[PDB]
Amino acid sequence: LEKDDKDAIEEKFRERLKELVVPKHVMDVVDEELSKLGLLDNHSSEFNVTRNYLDWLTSIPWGKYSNENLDLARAQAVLEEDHYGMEDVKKRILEFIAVSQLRGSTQGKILCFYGPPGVGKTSIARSIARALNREYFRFSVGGMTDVAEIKGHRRTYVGAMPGKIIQCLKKTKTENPLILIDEVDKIGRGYQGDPSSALLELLDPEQNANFLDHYLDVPVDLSKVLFICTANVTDTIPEPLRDRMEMINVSGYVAQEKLAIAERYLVPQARALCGLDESKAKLSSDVLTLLIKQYCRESGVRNLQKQVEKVLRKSAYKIVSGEAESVEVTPENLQDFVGKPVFTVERMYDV
Amino acid sequence: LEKDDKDAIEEKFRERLKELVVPKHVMDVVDEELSKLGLLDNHSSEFNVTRNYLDWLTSIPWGKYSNENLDLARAQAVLEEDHYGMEDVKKRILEFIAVSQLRGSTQGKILCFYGPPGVGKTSIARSIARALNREYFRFSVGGMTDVAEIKGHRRTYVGAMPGKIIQCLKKTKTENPLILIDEVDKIGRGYQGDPSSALLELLDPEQNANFLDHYLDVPVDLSKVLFICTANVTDTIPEPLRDRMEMINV
Numbered sequence: 160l161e162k163d164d165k166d167a168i169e170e171k172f173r174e175r176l177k178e179l180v181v182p183k184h185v186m187d188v189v190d191e192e193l194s195k196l197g198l199l200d201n202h203s204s205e206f207n208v209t210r211n212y213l214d215w216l217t218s219i220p221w222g223k224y225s226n227e228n229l230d231l232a233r234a235q236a237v238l239e240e241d242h243y244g245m246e247d248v249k250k251r252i253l254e255f256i257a258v259s260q261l262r263g264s265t266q267g268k269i270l271c272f273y274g275p276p277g278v279g280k281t282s283i284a285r286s287i288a289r290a291l292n293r294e295y296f297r298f299s300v301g302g303m304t305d306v307a308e309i310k311g312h313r314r315t316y317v318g319a320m321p322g323k324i325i326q327c328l329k330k331t332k333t334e335n336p337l338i339l340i341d342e343v344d345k346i347g348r349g350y351q352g353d354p355s356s357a358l359l360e361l362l363d364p365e366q367n368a369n370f371l372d373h374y375l376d377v378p379v380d381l382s383k384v385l386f387i388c389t390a391n392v393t394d395t396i397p398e399p400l401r402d403r404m405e406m407i408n409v410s411g412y413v414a415q416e417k418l419a420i421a422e423r424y425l426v427p428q429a430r431a432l433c434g435l436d437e438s439k440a441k442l443s444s445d446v447l448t449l450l451i452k453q454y455c456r457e458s459g460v461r462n463l464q465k466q467v468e469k470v471l472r473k474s475a476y477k478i479v480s481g482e483a484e485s486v487e488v489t490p491e492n493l494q495d496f497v498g499k500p501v502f503t504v505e506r507m508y509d510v
Numbered sequence: 511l512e513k514d515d516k517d518a519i520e521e522k523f524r525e526r527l528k529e530l531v532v533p534k535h536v537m538d539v540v541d542e543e544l545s546k547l548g549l550l551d552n553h554s555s556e557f558n559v560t561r562n563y564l565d566w567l568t569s570i571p572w573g574k575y576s577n578e579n580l581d582l583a584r585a586q587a588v589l590e591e592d593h594y595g596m597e598d599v600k601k602r603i604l605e606f607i608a609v610s611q612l613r614g615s616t617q618g619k620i621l622c623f624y625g626p627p628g629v630g631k632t633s634i635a636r637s638i639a640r641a642l643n644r645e646y647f648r649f650s651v652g653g654m655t656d657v658a659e660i661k662g663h664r665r666t667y668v669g670a671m672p673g674k675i676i677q678c679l680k681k682t683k684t685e686n687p688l689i690l691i692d693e694v695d696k697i698g699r700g701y702q703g704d705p706s707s708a709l710l711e712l713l714d715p716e717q718n719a720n721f722l723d724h725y726l727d728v729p730v731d732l733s734k735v736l737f738i739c740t741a742n743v744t745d746t747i748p749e750p751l752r753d754r755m756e757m758i759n760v
């Protein structure tokens with residue numbers, strides 16, 4: 160077993176590294192460690208750390224890129240297909256694809272939506288990632304207070320693994336994932352190395368190219384990512400970190416727009432969810448108008464979500480074991496069919 | 511000792527996996543960990559760690575569904591006899607089962623109760639779980655501050671164990687237990703990682719499907735669950751969290 164066994168894996172790391180355009184910072188560090196692996200007995204207690212370190216270091220993609228759809232004409236459709244309104248964020252992504260159409264190679268940026276809850280902030284990134292066609296990911300940071308998740312540990316410790324971003328980058332083979340940090344403003348104070356101190360080193364647009372996770376210390380390029388971050392309010396963020404990234408402000412909706420979203424997605428979205436059908440559980444557009452005028456006039460689009468869902472489920476139970484084979488919601492019933500209205504119709508002096 | 515060995519623990523895990531209908535995603539992580547176990551020397555700190563983490567990955571049910579009852583009036587009996595009145599909630603759950611019976615497969619939701627103390631808000635939960643047949647579980651959050659309790663720890667720490675809900679879930683084989691958070695108003699805040707920062711990830715009606723626990727990183731779909739939350743006065747709850755979950759006033 161002089162040439163057997165060890166030669167297999169040592170060749171294996173070659174093969175997996177062949178196709179990549181390995182950066183020169185790494186290519187020195189790799190092969191000498193492969194030599195060190197070639198020296199020692201397979202059962203040597205260190206061998207299982209080195210065999211691990213290569214398995215990560217051979218595996219994280221190095222300059223491999225998932226070519227993105229570039230034409231914006233077709234981008235308009237898919238960007239619109241799954242959300243309505245929100246024109247300014249649509250325009251910002253259109254600008255980004257425009258620039259990337261201009262200067263050849265793909266390139267990243269950072270952004271930070273923020274605004275009223277339920278505007279659609281978290282609900283868009285999946286759409287964008289389908290739009291550009293760069294690989295999606297998501298990574299909530301809410302309440303996190305341990306920097307190790309953004310960094311990893313030193314590999315001296317048993318079982319140490321690289322910071323979460325590297326696990327992402329392995330799991331989404333392309334080098335330019337659409338990372339989506341989330342709920343940034345509610346990130347915790349860990350009272351010993353809180354994460355806000357960490358994030359600045361990642362998110363700085365110029366310094367980002369040399370992020371260095373503690374586990375495998377070799378620098379990784381990261382300009383290509385398109386980070387996105389969201390928060391319902393933008394005061395908790397420390398001042399420099401607030402400086403680092405653009406703050407698009409998602410807008411709250413208005414009752415014309417609420418009705419607009421209503422017919423297009425919401426009612427179908429839940430009618431399929433409950434299994435009802437057209438002509439068995441019909442809703443007038445005037446019922447949808449009245450729900451907004453009376454029962455829900457808040458900036459979000461969750462509240463109306465719950466009204467228009469409950470209105471269906473009442474009909475659900477009212478059919479399957481009730482006496483009517485088909486409900487037909489009409490305005491005359493709503494005051495009882497959903498509860499008493501919140502908003503009053505301010506009609507005091509008609510005389 | 512029945513010849514304890516690498517291939518034996520590898521088998522017992524493998525056999526344990528079969529009945530489950532695992533998501534294709536986590537199956538690959540398990541297959542890598544299995545090879546990494548087999549190569550690893552038997553007695554070493556890395557080995558016992560990785561064996562433990564793989565044990566947890568097999569222990570979590572994947573796709574098991576304790577049967578949800580379907581009959582309405584027969585459920586109405588068990589929801590009526592042991593708690594007088596409170597027509598609102600007894601009507602709500604009845605509507606919900608009417609839907610779940612209608613659209614085939616079981617499906618979760620989320621909701622919350624609020625009102626004067628002693629109205630029975632906590633009392634009704636176990637009656638519900640007996641009515642719909644979902645396995646019960648409860649865990650007060652009152653006064654809790656350490657966020658890790660609902661998200662575990664990194665697993666490279668010596669004794670780290672997965673967050674609370676996963677412990678709730680391994681013990682009761684259903685993928686759809688009726689978790690019953692209690693006293694949401696009085697979660698700890700203002701000096702350590704607020705649990706409220708974390709709860710949004712759970713209670714998001716749709717995004718919960720990729721809840722991601724620190725210990726076992728692999729996303730844990732839990733959309734089928736039926737959370738319930740209680741709080742005698744609905745003011746201390748920060749607004750974004752109050753958005754997620756429909757209020758009901760006994």
Ligand SMILES: Nc1ncnc2c1ncn2[C@@H]1O[C@H](COP(=O)(O)OP(=O)(O)OP(O)(O)=S)[C@@H](O)[C@H]1O
Pocket residue numbers: 241242243244245275276277278279280281282283389390391420424460461750753
């Ligand atoms: N223009 C839109 N079209 C369709 N659905 C929308 C739109 N805007 C918002 N939504 C809905 O908003 C819901 C939640 O989206 P989210 O962005 O998660 O809400 P949110 O604004 O992130 O609130 P948070 O979680 O407090 S930051 C989803 O059910 C979407 O369907």
Ligand SMILES: Nc1ncnc2c1ncn2[C@@H]1O[C@H](COP(=O)(O)OP(=O)(O)OP(O)(O)=S)[C@@H](O)[C@H]1O
Pocket residue numbers: 592593594595596626627628629630631632633634740741742
């Ligand atoms: N309709 C009812 N039938 C029978 N017992 C009831 C009813 N409503 C309330 N109770 C009683 O309410 C008592 C306590 O119920 P709880 O739900 O704990 O009250 P509570 O409203 O939860 O108050 P908390 O603990 O401050 S939130 C039990 O002894 C029940 O027997």
Ligand SMILES: [Mg+2]
Pocket residue numbers: 280281282
């Ligand atoms: Mg959100």
Ligand SMILES: [Mg+2]
Pocket residue numbers: 631632633740
């Ligand atoms: Mg109680």
